[PDB]
Design a protein around this ligand. Sequence first.
Ligand SMILES: OC[C@H]1O[C@H](OC[C@H]2O[C@H](O)[C@@H](O)[C@@H](O)[C@@H]2O)[C@@H](O)[C@@H](O)[C@@H]1O
Ligand SMILES: OC[C@H]1O[C@H](OC[C@H]2O[C@H](O)[C@@H](O)[C@@H](O)[C@@H]2O)[C@@H](O)[C@@H](O)[C@@H]1O
Ligand SMILES: OC[C@H]1O[C@H](OC[C@H]2O[C@H](O)[C@@H](O)[C@@H](O)[C@@H]2O)[C@@H](O)[C@@H](O)[C@@H]1O
Ligand SMILES: OC[C@H]1O[C@H](OC[C@H]2O[C@H](O)[C@@H](O)[C@@H](O)[C@@H]2O)[C@@H](O)[C@@H](O)[C@@H]1O
Ligand SMILES: OC[C@H]1O[C@H](OC[C@H]2O[C@H](O)[C@@H](O)[C@@H](O)[C@@H]2O)[C@@H](O)[C@@H](O)[C@@H]1O
Ligand SMILES: OC[C@H]1O[C@H](OC[C@H]2O[C@H](O)[C@@H](O)[C@@H](O)[C@@H]2O)[C@@H](O)[C@@H](O)[C@@H]1O
Lengths: 121, 121
Amino acid sequence: SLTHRKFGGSGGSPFSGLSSIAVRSGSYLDAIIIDGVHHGGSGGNLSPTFTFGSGEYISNMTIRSGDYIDNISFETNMGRRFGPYGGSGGSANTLSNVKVIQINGSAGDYLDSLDIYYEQY
Amino acid sequence: SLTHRKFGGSGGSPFSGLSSIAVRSGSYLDAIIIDGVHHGGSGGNLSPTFTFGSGEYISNMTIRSGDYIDNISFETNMGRRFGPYGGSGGSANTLSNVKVIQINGSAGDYLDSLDIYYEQY
Ligand SMILES: OC[C@H]1O[C@H](OC[C@H]2O[C@H](O)[C@@H](O)[C@@H](O)[C@@H]2O)[C@@H](O)[C@@H](O)[C@@H]1O
Ligand SMILES: OC[C@H]1O[C@H](OC[C@H]2O[C@H](O)[C@@H](O)[C@@H](O)[C@@H]2O)[C@@H](O)[C@@H](O)[C@@H]1O
Ligand SMILES: OC[C@H]1O[C@H](OC[C@H]2O[C@H](O)[C@@H](O)[C@@H](O)[C@@H]2O)[C@@H](O)[C@@H](O)[C@@H]1O
Ligand SMILES: OC[C@H]1O[C@H](OC[C@H]2O[C@H](O)[C@@H](O)[C@@H](O)[C@@H]2O)[C@@H](O)[C@@H](O)[C@@H]1O
Ligand SMILES: OC[C@H]1O[C@H](OC[C@H]2O[C@H](O)[C@@H](O)[C@@H](O)[C@@H]2O)[C@@H](O)[C@@H](O)[C@@H]1O
Ligand SMILES: OC[C@H]1O[C@H](OC[C@H]2O[C@H](O)[C@@H](O)[C@@H](O)[C@@H]2O)[C@@H](O)[C@@H](O)[C@@H]1O
């Protein structure tokens, strides 16, 4: 059921809960690091951390996936790019004209899966 | 249009991007701190940090609000409680039998507003 509700008044400036992202990656995604928390194994190489600016969100996103997440890249509403990181296995899926709200998933020694919650425009 | 999609396989342990919450509070919520990141001003007193265990999420939430967020409390599916923190003003609203996915909002000197993304059951 993805829904939302707003509480409170009109002032202040917006913020998002999803503030930064890095991955460890080789032939697949070994890990995803979200707001500085690590999920997945120790294999592969650690990427730079992408930290969202104020009012910046993921608008375009590409994931390769089979049994695991094989690869990820994304772009933001401000033309900033992350990746691609990972291998060529899996099949490509793309999200276009979106605003990503949250990234959940499941992870063992590898990044098994990703659940992306988002708005579709 | 709010949506979600899962990519990849079914192994691994589930994880959420929303891993921890603390607030600064006095009369109002001065700030909320999401995965260590501060949103709001410097006032009030800093709460302890609530960190979600694996597969733990917010299932019930009372927020009092007016022009700002006056008070927050929540219970998780595991029976753990955070708060109440803040004061007596505003009006109460409750989310009940939900699973909160993400906490966005707006903040200045204080926590003006919360935008809660959740699934309703
Ligand atoms: O991201 C997965 C791994 O990617 C690279 O390893 C490639 C292969 O190396 C050896 O053949 C075996 O370990 C295979 O399992 C593996 O696919 C490395 O960067 C590794 O550290 C990653 O875990
Ligand atoms: O997401 C990873 C892979 O998912 C699928 O499974 C390929 C399988 O190949 C062999 O059976 C073993 O190496 C298994 O570990 C592996 O899952 C495919 O879509 C593949 O292209 C992906 O790389
Ligand atoms: O992220 C991949 C898996 O991670 C953990 O299990 C790893 C095990 O997979 C197979 O049982 C064998 O290849 C073992 O050698 C290996 O340790 C679990 O979280 C699992 O659910 C994931 O699929
Ligand atoms: O949570 C907001 C503030 O709550 C308390 O402020 C008490 C009083 O301070 C000043 O007299 C005015 O701001 C009044 O409106 C307010 O009731 C304190 O904990 C303060 O530190 C917080 O910022
Ligand atoms: O959520 C905060 C309050 O919002 C409304 O009150 C507006 C006025 O409250 C106090 O007089 C000061 O903070 C003023 O700056 C502000 O304009 C009411 O809904 C109240 O009940 C809330 O506590
Ligand atoms: O978080 C509450 C507000 O924080 C900032 O500014 C504080 C302003 O509060 C009242 O509008 C007046 O007392 C002003 O003098 C004072 O600067 C702003 O970010 C505002 O948008 C927030 O509502």
